[PDB]
Ligand binder design. Structure first.
Ligand SMILES: *CC[C@H](O)[C@H](O)COP(=O)(O)O
Ligand SMILES: *CC[C@H](O)[C@H](O)COP(=O)(O)O
Ligand SMILES: [Co+2]
Ligand SMILES: [Co+2]
Ligand SMILES: [Mg+2]
Ligand SMILES: [Mg+2]
Ligand code: NI
Ligand code: NI
Ligand code: NI
Ligand code: NI
Ligand code: NI
Ligand code: NI
Lengths: 254, 254
C-alpha cells in the first residue's frame, strides 16, 4: 500500500510539478493502468475546463480512451484544437479526428482540426506547408491554448509513430537507440533534450518548449513500458500536471 | 415524352461517347434529378465493376449520394482509390472519406485515401508535396484505374469548391467569369480547355487528359445548373460514359 498523497507530493517536489495525481490501479498491467488513468483524465478535464478556455489535445490510444470517457459540460466560448496532425500514410489510423470530435462535443464546440501528417519527408516541404494561413492559424491557436492534454509515447517496435509511414528503417533504428519517447510526436532523450534536430525540423505541431508556458500542460501516462519516457518528459519540464498510477509513480521515485 | 433511347444515341453520336444513359426523372428540379441519377449510377457501378478492377472515385454531393445507394458485390481483387484529395481548410466537409469508404465496402476492399487538399496555395508546395512516395503511389493508382467515376461541378456562388478555403475572392471571381465547371476540381471552359494553368498547377489529383485514356470514364450529372458544365466536359472528351436525365439531355441536344 502506497500513500498516494505521499507519492504525489514526492513527485511534485522531485520534478517541480504544479500537480501530481497518483491514481490507484490495482494491477501493474498496461491495459489496466491505462484504463484507470484515462478515466481519471476525463474527470480531471471535466472539472478543469471553464468558459473561454482554449484546449489543445494530442492523439493516440491513451487520448482516444480519455475522449471516450468524456462527459458533457455546460461551458461557453471554449475552443478545442488539435496540437499535431494525425494523418497516416499507412493503413494504420490514429483516430485523431474521432478523439478531438469527442472532446469538442463534451465542451459544446466544434473541433479545430490540423489536417496534416505530423512528420513530413523533409524540412523544405514542412516549411512550405506550414506557411498556409489556415495551418498558421491552427498552430497559433495551439500556442494560445492555456490547457494542453497529452501522453508520452515509447520507442517500442509497435509504437504507433513507427506504423504511420513517417520514418524509414534507419530512422526508426536511430530513435529506438537514442530516444526514450515522444510528446506530440517530438522525440526526446532521457534528459528531455530533442534527439534529432533534423527530424524535429520535419515536424508540424506544438513545440515542446511551448508546453512549458501553459497554465496547464497535462501528461497522462503510466505502465512499466513508459517509466523511462515519463522520466524524460518530466526532466524536460514539459508538463506541470501529471496523472499517473501508483506502480509507475513508485518506479519513478525509486 | 422523350424516346430515351433516341436521346441517348443522339448524345452518343454528337459527343462520340461509348455510352449515354438517359435516365427518366419526372420533374426538372435539381434534387429530383440528382436523386434519380445517383440511383442509376449506383446500379451501373454494381453491374460494371469486376474482379481485378481499379476504380477511381471523385467526391461531392452527387458522389456521396451514389455511395449511399451502393449495394455490395462479391468481387475479388478490386482496388478503390480516391482521384483527388478532399481535405477542407474551412468548416465545410466534403465527405470524401465517407464516400470512398462506402464504395470500397461495396467492392469488398479498403479505401486507398489521398490525404490532401486538392488545391494548394502555390505550385512550389504542390510540387514538394506530390513527391512523397505515398502520394505518388496513390496518384499512379489513379492513372492505372480502368474505371473513373465523377460528376462535373458548377461555378455558382455556393459551389462546394468555393467553400473549402482554397481560393481567394479574386480567383473565385475569375473562375465564375471564365470557367463553366470542374471535373475532379480542375476547371475548364465551354470548349473543355483548362481555364488557368496557374490554378491547375496548384492541384493534385487525376489530370483531365488522363481520364481520356480509361476503359470507363463515367460522368454522372444533370440539372439546368449543370447544362453548360456538362457541355464543356463532353466537348473536352473527358468522359466516355454519360449518365444524365432527359431534361438535361434535351437541353444539350437542342
Ligand atoms: C501523438 C503520439 C503520442 O504521443 C504517442 O506516441 C502514442 O500515444 P499512446 O501511447 O497513447 O498510443
Ligand atoms: C470534386 C468536386 C466536384 O467535381 C464538384 O465540384 C462538386 O460535386 P457536386 O456537384 O456533386 O456537389
Ligand atoms: Co531492411
Ligand atoms: Co471583398
Ligand atoms: Mg481498473
Ligand atoms: Mg425520382
Ligand atoms: Ni459537472
Ligand atoms: Ni533522473
Ligand atoms: Ni506494483
Ligand atoms: Ni449483383
Ligand atoms: Ni457546342
Ligand atoms: Ni423538361
Amino acid at each position: 500500500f502506497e500513500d498516494l498523497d505521499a507519492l504525489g507530493s514526492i513527485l511534485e517536489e522531485k520534478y517541480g510539478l504544479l500537480e501530481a495525481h497518483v491514481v490507484f490501479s490495482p494491477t501493474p498491467d498496461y491495459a489496466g493502468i491505462t484504463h484507470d488513468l484515462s478515466r481519471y483524465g476525463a474527470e480531471y478535464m471535466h472539472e478543469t475546463v471553464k468558459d473561454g478556455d482554449i484546449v489543445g489535445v494530442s492523439w493516440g490510444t491513451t487520448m482516444y480512451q480519455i475522449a471516450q470517457n468524456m462527459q458533457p459540460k455546460q461551458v461557453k466560448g471554449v475552443e478545442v484544437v488539435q496540437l499535431k496532425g494525425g494523418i497516416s500514410h499507412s493503413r494504420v489510423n490514429t483516430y485523431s479526428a474521432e478523439t478531438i470530435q469527442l472532446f469538442a462535443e463534451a465542451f459544446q464546440t466544434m473541433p479545430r482540426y490540423l489536417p496534416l501528417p505530423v512528420v513530413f519527408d523533409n524540412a523544405d516541404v514542412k516549411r512550405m506547408v506550414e506557411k498556409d494561413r489556415h495551418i498558421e492559424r491552427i498552430i497559433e491557436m495551439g500556442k494560445q491554448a492555456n490547457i494542453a492534454l497529452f501522453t508520452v509515447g515509447t520507442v517500442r517496435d509497435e509504437a504507433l509513430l513507427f506504423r504511420l509511414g513517417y520514418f524509414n528503417e534507419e530512422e526508426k533504428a536511430l530513435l529506438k537507440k537514442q530516444a526514450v519517447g515522444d510528446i506530440c510526436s517530438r522525440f526526446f532523450d532521457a534528459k528531455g533534450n530533442i534527439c534529432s534536430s533534423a527530424i524535429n525540423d520535419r515536424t508540424i505541431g506544438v513545440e515542446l518548449q511551448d508546453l512549458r508556458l501553459k497554465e496547464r500542460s497535462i501528461l497522462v501516462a503510466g505502465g512499466s513500458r513508459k517509466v523511462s519516457s515519463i522520466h524524460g518528459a518530466l526532466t524536460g519540464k514539459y508538463a506541470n500536471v501529471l496523472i499517473i498510477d501508483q506502480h509507475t509513480a513508485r518506479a519513478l521515485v525509486n
